[PDB]
Amino acid sequence: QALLRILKETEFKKIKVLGSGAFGTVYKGLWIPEGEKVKIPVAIKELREATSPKANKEILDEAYVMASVDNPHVCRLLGICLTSTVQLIMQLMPFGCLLDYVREHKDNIGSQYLLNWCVQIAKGMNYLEDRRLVHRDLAARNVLVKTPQHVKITDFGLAKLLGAEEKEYHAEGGKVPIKWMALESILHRIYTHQSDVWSYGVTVWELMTFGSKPYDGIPASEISSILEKGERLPQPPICTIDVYMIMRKCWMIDADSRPKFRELIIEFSKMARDPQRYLVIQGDERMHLPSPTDSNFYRALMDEEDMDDVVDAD
Amino acid sequence: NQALLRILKETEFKKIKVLGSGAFGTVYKGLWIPEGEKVKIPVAIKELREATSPKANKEILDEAYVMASVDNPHVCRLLGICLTSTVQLIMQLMPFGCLLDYVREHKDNIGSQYLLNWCVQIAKGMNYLEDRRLVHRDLAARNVLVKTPQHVKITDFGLAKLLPIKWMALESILHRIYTHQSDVWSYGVTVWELMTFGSKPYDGIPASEISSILEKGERLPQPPICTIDVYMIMRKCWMIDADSRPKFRELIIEFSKMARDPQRYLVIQGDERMHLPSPTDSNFYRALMDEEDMDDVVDAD
Ligand SMILES: *CCC(=O)Nc1ccc(OC)c(Nc2cc(-c3[nH]c(SC)nc3-c3ccc(F)cc3)ccn2)c1
Numbered sequence: 001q002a003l004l005r006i007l008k009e010t011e012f013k014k015i016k017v018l019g020s021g022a023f024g025t026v027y028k029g030l031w032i033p034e035g036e037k038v039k040i041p042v043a044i045k046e047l048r049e050a051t052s053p054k055a056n057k058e059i060l061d062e063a064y065v066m067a068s069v070d071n072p073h074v075c076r077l078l079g080i081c082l083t084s085t086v087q088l089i090m091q092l093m094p095f096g097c098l099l100d101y102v103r104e105h106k107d108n109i110g111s112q113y114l115l116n117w118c119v120q121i122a123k124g125m126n127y128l129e130d131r132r133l134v135h136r137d138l139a140a141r142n143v144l145v146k147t148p149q150h151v152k153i154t155d156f157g158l159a160k161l162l163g164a165e166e167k168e169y170h171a172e173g174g175k176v177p178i179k180w181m182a183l184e185s186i187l188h189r190i191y192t193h194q195s196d197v198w199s200y201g202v203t204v205w206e207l208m209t210f211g212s213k214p215y216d217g218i219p220a221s222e223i224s225s226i227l228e229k230g231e232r233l234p235q236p237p238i239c240t241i242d243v244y245m246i247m248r249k250c251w252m253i254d255a256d257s258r259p260k261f262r263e264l265i266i267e268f269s270k271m272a273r274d275p276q277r278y279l280v281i282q283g284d285e286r287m288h289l290p291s292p293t294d295s296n297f298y299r300a301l302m303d304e305e306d307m308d309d310v311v312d313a314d
Numbered sequence: 315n316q317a318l319l320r321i322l323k324e325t326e327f328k329k330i331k332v333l334g335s336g337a338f339g340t341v342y343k344g345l346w347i348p349e350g351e352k353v354k355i356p357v358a359i360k361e362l363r364e365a366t367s368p369k370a371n372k373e374i375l376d377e378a379y380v381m382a383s384v385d386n387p388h389v390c391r392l393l394g395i396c397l398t399s400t401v402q403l404i405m406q407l408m409p410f411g412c413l414l415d416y417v418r419e420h421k422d423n424i425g426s427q428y429l430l431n432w433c434v435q436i437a438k439g440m441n442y443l444e445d446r447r448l449v450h451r452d453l454a455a456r457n458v459l460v461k462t463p464q465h466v467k468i469t470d471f472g473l474a475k476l477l478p479i480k481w482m483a484l485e486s487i488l489h490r491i492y493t494h495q496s497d498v499w500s501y502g503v504t505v506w507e508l509m510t511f512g513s514k515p516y517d518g519i520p521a522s523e524i525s526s527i528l529e530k531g532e533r534l535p536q537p538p539i540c541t542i543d544v545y546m547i548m549r550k551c552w553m554i555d556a557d558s559r560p561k562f563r564e565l566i567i568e569f570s571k572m573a574r575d576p577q578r579y580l581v582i583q584g585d586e587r588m589h590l591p592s593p594t595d596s597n598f599y600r601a602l603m604d605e606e607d608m609d610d611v612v613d614a615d
Pocket residue numbers: 018019021026028043044045077078087088089090091092093094095096097098099100140141142144154155
């Protein structure tokens with residue numbers, strides 16, 4: 001009901017393009033509330049069009065679901081405007097997406113951050129599973145940085161909302177994240193919590209490689225074949241076997257032998273209490289989590305929502 | 315807790331726009347840039363007017379630690395300091411500005427629910443300070459900030475004695491004594507500022523004379539939109555006997571009861587349309603701009 005605000009074009013304006021993806025383009029926007037003199041920064045995503053004649057009531061029905069997620073590590077859909085285009089509004093994250101972030105800070109990112117991000121993504125996915133929601137497009141590009149200490153999963157439900165043609169399954173770099181999908185999703189369009197776990201495995205690989213592209217050079221139309229031959233992403237240079245073993249367990253053919261998200265929370269949290277034993281990174285001692293003074297300052301300005309503490313080295 | 319006050323360097327922030335001035339200094343909109351990042355985070359900066367020596371900065375710094383230690387949804391927390399030649403204080407930017415200029419700009423477009431809820435929230439904020447045995451000394455409509463129209467916060471705590479006759483209690487004018495009950499006096503003047511949509515108290519009466527007219531029993535007039543039950547509360551805050559003025563705890567309860575029957579205690583033209591936002595609008599505001607936890611506001615019955 002009340003969790004989702006219906007906007008009109010008169011009360012917001014796209015100000016500047018931030019990025020473009022398969023689901024649409026994201027603009028920095030301004031909400032201009034009824035009868036006020038302020039401009040509030042917002043993020044606006046104008047979606048490309050769904051491959052299905054989507055009734056507005058069922059666009060709104062999906063959006064209410066998206067507006068109902070209440071968890072520190074999943075972004076909640078705040079508003080929608082249904083005109084010629086479908087435009088979604090939510091809180092602007094000035095730090096951008098986690099894939100761009102790890103690429104840009106490749107040389108100054110330590111084990112404590114990498115492992116805590118793992119935990120927080122797993123926490124956000126565990127929430128979705130408890131709500132019986134399947135993301136279908138979990139990836140590092142779909143994790144946003146609210147602060148460097150706080151990441152949140154975005155864009156859930158949009159894969160099932162917009163769908164995709166069958167041509168973009170059998171084609172290179174399109175609207176279907178073939179190289180992030182479990183084999184059963186590629187072959188049969190089967191999407192469960194356990195194939196979200198597969199995508200979580202690929203997401204962790206992106207982070208541990210500081211933003212490498214998975215299976216680069218192998219055409220997307222061939223990924224289904226190499227997966228059935230047993231080929232998987234290689235062990236990132238900074239990962240001990242403990243971390244690589246978890247990754248490979250997520251890419252097992254039999255879905256129900258993959259780990260559960262709740263298990264992944266527990267093991268990545270264990271590893272975050274002694275991060276130097278599980279990731280080998282040069283200069284890792286010259287990189288720490290923020291001090292208490294710095295986290296209190298970050299939170300009071302920009303991140304006031306309830307959140308569990310980051311897992312620190314004992 | 316020394317970890318509640320960040321010591322800023324000049325290199326990591328910049329003043330962008332002037333937002334206003336005050337008895338204590340000049341207020342800027344600024345941008346904080348964290349080290350190693352490329353983002354620009356808006357902040358409010360207050361630059362004090364007088365320059366200070368190292369010995370004077372030590373007294374300022376320890377007072378700042380107390381300001382940084384206030385934690386309540388209706389009192390603004392001091393977040394940082396930069397000890398230059400001329401001191402600068404940093405807190406979170408309240409984009410809707412100060413309530414004084416807000417009510418002046420929205421004169422005949424503010425419903426009764428907003429006014430009474432602002433009085434509840436201000437009282438809650440002062441009651442927190444009293445509970446911590448902290449005296450504001452400069453409560454006024456210009457020192458209540460608007461985070462959202464539904465959420466206001468007292469600012470500038472502790473600045474007064476660290477470094478407003480027509481807001482002060484008689485005992486403070488005559489003998490420079492400041493107590494929680496003198497804060498209650500200025501609460502009444504603040505409520506008077508709100509109800510007249512930002513009129514100037516005791517207009518055209520020189521500050522040198524306020525002492526003497528108060529002695530003779532002259533008090534600010536009944537605002538036109540106020541029922542006599544609102545005005546009597548205000549009148550109780552301006553009694554010469556400090557301890558028979560209302561207590562901040564009692565004001566929360568009184569205005570909250572009134573906030574549930576808002577149109578019987580304030581009579582406003584066109585009030586049948588200025589209701590506080592639906593749950594939908596209020597959820598939007600909070601997820602977008604105001605994620606801190608705060609008790610619900612008092613809606614009608
Ligand atoms: C990883 C790619 C990316 O999103 N980069 C990026 C660059 C600049 C930015 O502004 C500071 C942001 N902020 C941001 C983005 C989003 C968002 N990102 C995506 S990519 C799949 N999709 C969205 C989005 C926006 C609005 C909605 F209603 C739903 C989804 C969201 C908030 N802040 C990011």
